[PDB]
């Protein structure tokens, strides 16, 4: 079970630090938590007003990865539009609390499956909640979360990209470092790396359904601007 190379330990440091500096409320998300009261456009309203800072945190995460910063702005835009809801969904799923059955948004707002579903997310709310439940036994630390985020960001198959092959190599570096970190961490769950790769697929489905749903059916001034831009 190969463990992290030194060049991979500093990539682990770079990514973990980027995640921790752009992750809302850091460790005090549970205490700061505030429980909230077809589509409820009033529930919708409350959610659209609170997605802008969550999108901005993803932008900030990416900007703290030098490999991201090396790409042309046209590719940076494409990578961020692709992975934004994938990372927001992971960051909320890892904050699943089984006792209240809530996820935490912006490190401060606890929401139920029914609330998020009626905020306009539909089946995506069940997919995010199910992921959170499945992730409770994975005991993902900040490093494992940051690396998953970095794998999702460096997706070479987003349409319209120019630097397809450089982005692929960035991702291969992250995947190798991450598997080696997982070897070092020796989790007590069988076939951990294969099961983690299935969780990536789960997040990609959330990203592809999110994007599809925006497109579908829906007055757009009612949507935050940064959120119209990411669909």
């Amino acid at each position: 079970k190969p463990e992290p190379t030194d060049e991979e330990w500093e990539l682990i440091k770079t990514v973990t630090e980027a995640h921790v500096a752009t992750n809302a409320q850091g460790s005090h998300w549970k205490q700061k938590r505030k429980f909230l009261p077809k589509v409820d456009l009033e529930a919708f309203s409350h959610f659209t007003k609170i997605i802008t800072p969550a999108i901005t945190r993803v932008v900030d995460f990416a900007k703290k990865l030098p490999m991201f910063c090396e790409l042309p702005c046209e590719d940076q835009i494409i990578l961020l539009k692709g992975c934004c809801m994938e990372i927001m969904s992971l960051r909320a799923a890892v904050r699943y609390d089984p006792e209240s059955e809530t996820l935490t948004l912006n490190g401060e707002m606890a929401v139920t499956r029914g609330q998020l579903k009626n905020g306009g997310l539909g089946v995506v709310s069940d997919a995010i909640f199910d992921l959170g439940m499945s992730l409770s036994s994975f005991n993902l630390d900040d490093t494992e979360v940051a690396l998953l985020q970095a794998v999702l960001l460096m997706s070479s198959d987003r349409p319209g990209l120019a630097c397809v092959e450089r982005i692929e190599k960035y991702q291969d570096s992250f995947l190798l470092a991450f598997e080696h970190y997982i070897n070092y961490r020796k989790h007590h769950v069988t076939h951990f790396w294969p099961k983690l790769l299935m969780k990536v697929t789960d997040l990609r489905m959330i990203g592809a359904c999110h994007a599809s749903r925006f497109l579908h059916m829906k007055p757009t001034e009612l949507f935050p601007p940064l959120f119209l831009e990411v669909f």
Binding site: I77, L80, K81, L226
Partner: peptide, 11 residues
């Protein structure tokens, strides 16, 4: 298009 995101990226 993608002009807020562009501003936020280029700093």
């Amino acid at each position: 298009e993608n002009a807020l995101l562009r501003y936020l990226l280029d700093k």
